Design a protein around this ligand. Structure first.
Ligand SMILES: O=C(N[C@@H]1[C@@H](OP(=O)(O)O)[C@H](OP(=O)(O)O)[C@H](OP(=O)(O)O)[C@H](OP(=O)(O)O)[C@H]1OP(=O)(O)O)C(F)(F)P(=O)(O)O
Length: 155
C-alpha cells in the first residue's frame, strides 16, 4: 500500500541531512522513518501544537533561526542567522537533521548552498541545485548571497 507522504519539496542533502518545506501531520509517518535527532526551522512563526507534539513524542530537538521574509529586489538575507544554522548543521551529534522553511526554496536553499560552498562545490554546481528546488521562484539575490558568502570562519 502506497501510504508514506514526504513533506513538500523533500530531499536528502547528504548523509544525515534532509531539506523540505513545512511538514504537516500527513508527513509524520514518513519523517518517523528517518529517525531524526533535530529540525533546523528557518521561519520566525511559532511551531504549531501538532508539530510540537510530534517532536516531543519522537525526541526531536527544534533549532529555530527566524529569518524574516522579503521579496526581490528588497531582499537582504540575514548572514548571522544562516551562520548560526550552519554551526548547528555541521555538528554530527545533531544528525539526522531536517532543514525546513515554508516551501523549502529560499531560506532552506540558501543554507544548503552555503553548506555546498563549505564542501568546495563550484558555484555553477551550487546554483544548479538551488535552481532545481526554487524553479520559477529562483532569485538572483539568493545566488548572490551564496557567491559572496565568506567560508573562512567555518574552515
Ligand atoms: O516560504 C517562503 N517564502 C514565500 C514568501 O513568504 P515569506 O518569505 O514572506 O514567509 C511569500 O511572500 P509573501 O507573498 O508573503 O510576500 C511568497 O513570496 P513572493 O514575494 O514571491 O510572493 C512565496 O511565494 P509563492 O509561494 O510563489 O507565493 C514565497 O515562497 P516560495 O514559493 O518558496 O517563493 C520562504 F520561507 F522564503 P521558503 O524559504 O520556505 O521558500
Amino acid at each position: 500500500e502506497l501510504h508514506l507522504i514526504p513533506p513538500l519539496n523533500f530531499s536528502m542533502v547528504d548523509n544525515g541531512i534532509f531539506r523540505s518545506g513545512f511538514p504537516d501531520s500527513a508527513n509524520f509517518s514518513f519523517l518517523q522513518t528517518l529517525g531524526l535527532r533535530s529540525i533546523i526551522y528557518l521561519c520566525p512563526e511559532p511551531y504549531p501544537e501538532s508539530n510540537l507534539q510530534f517532536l516531543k513524542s519522537n525526541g526531536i530537538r527544534l533549532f529555530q533561526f527566524g529569518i524574516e521574509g522579503n521579496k526581490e529586489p528588497f531582499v537582504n538575507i540575514p548572514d548571522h542567522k544562516i551562520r548560526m544554522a550552519l554551526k548547528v548543521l555541521l555538528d554530527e551529534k545533531n544528525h539526522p537533521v531536517l532543514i525546513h522553511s515554508k516551501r523549502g526554496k529560499h531560506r532552506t536553499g540558501c543554507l544548503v548552498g552555503c553548506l555546498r560552498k563549505l564542501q568546495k562545490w563550484c558555484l555553477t554546481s551550487i546554483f544548479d541545485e538551488y535552481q532545481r528546488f526554487a524553479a520559477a521562484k529562483a532569485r538572483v539575490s539568493d545566488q548572490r548571497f551564496m557567491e559572496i558568502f565568506d567560508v573562512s570562519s567555518f574552515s
